[model samples]
Structure formats: C-alpha cells, structure tokens
Target: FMLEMEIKITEVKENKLIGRKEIYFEIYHPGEPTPSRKDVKGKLVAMLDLNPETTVIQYIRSYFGSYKSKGYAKYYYDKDRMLYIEPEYILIRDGI
Candidate 1:
C-alpha cells in the first residue's frame, strides 16, 4: 500500500509596501487524523534569487500532525507580491 499525503493553502496575506507576508496551510493525512494548525508556524528554510528582480523562497520542516511530523512549502516573492504558494507533505523514509 502507498500513503498519500497532500497540502492545501488555507490563507495568504501580504503587505505590499513593506514586503511582508503570512501564509497558512493545512495538511491532509490519507489514513489518519492530523494535528491542528493553530500555533504552527513554518521556518524559513531557503531562499533563491532567480534573477535581479525575482527571488524564490522555501520553508522546510514545517509543523504538522502535532509537531511530530514535518512538511514544507515553496513560493516566490517579487516586487511587492507573492506568487504560487504550494505546500507539500514530506515523510522521511531514510536517515543519514
């Protein structure tokens, strides 16, 4: 059997002038119940500069399913807005 996981964008807000944003996301567990999204804040994992006027952002190891599981979200910020907010649920299958 395969475990299916998905992430959904619940809310998105930004201040254009100040270049600030807040994103809210939720996770859907295929076979079991997940944790609440309240008090769950994502950490800034990485940022990539695509060009002189564009920048991509990624948040990894985000909170999900009672703070025990990890997830991630990827998006981009340019000029004064954020574009394409997509969150994904990731399950670690191997360790280093």
Candidate 2:
C-alpha cells in the first residue's frame, strides 16, 4: 500500500462581514487511506501560509471508493474571533 496527496482549493469566500475566509477544498489520494484532520490542515498551512492559530478545519469527508475527499475550512484574520463563530467542540478539536 502507498499514499500520496494532492490538495486543491476548490473555493474561498472572504466573509468580510464575519471577518473570516471560508474555504472549500478537496484532496485526491488514490490508493491512500483517508487523511486525518491535522495532516490535511497542515497541507493547507503549507499551501497558503495560513496561521494555524487562526485557521480551523471544520470537516473532511471521504467517499467509500472514490479516492478523493472534500472539506471545509474557516480562517480568521482576528485570531480570537473564532470563539464567537465556531462551535466549542470544533475549536477544541482544532487544538485551540
């Protein structure tokens, strides 16, 4: 078994009203296992130069045999603003 990753930023919406950048992304990993949240989040950081403290990956879901995964992310300019907008559980999961 082998694993390789290809990350694509599907969309990005800068929510000025809420002070965050909402993102949608996909990972193509043929013959690879589903990636963990931290790993994918790390990919995003490497891809975008995002601030981990201000960036939170909401969810990543994979299909049964599609060899691909999709997810959402929320990135904030105001580091602490997430406390108000994100669920406590998610924040905790993100290691906030």
Best by TM-score: 2
User: lDDT per residue, candidate 2, 1-96, as tens digits?
Assistant: 356687999999999999999999998877778887888888998898999888899999899969899989999999768888888899899777
Q: Where in model 2 is the C-alpha error above 4 Å?
A: none
- Cα error, candidate 2, residue 33 (Å): 1.2
Q: How does candidate 2 score on lDDT?
A: 0.89
Whole-model lDDT per candidate: 0.36, 0.89
Flag regions of model 1 displaced more than 4 Å: 31-96
TM-score of 1: 0.33
| Cα lDDT tens digits for candidate 1, 1-96 | 675445555555664654545444555555645432321222222111223222223332434445234433323355334422232221111000
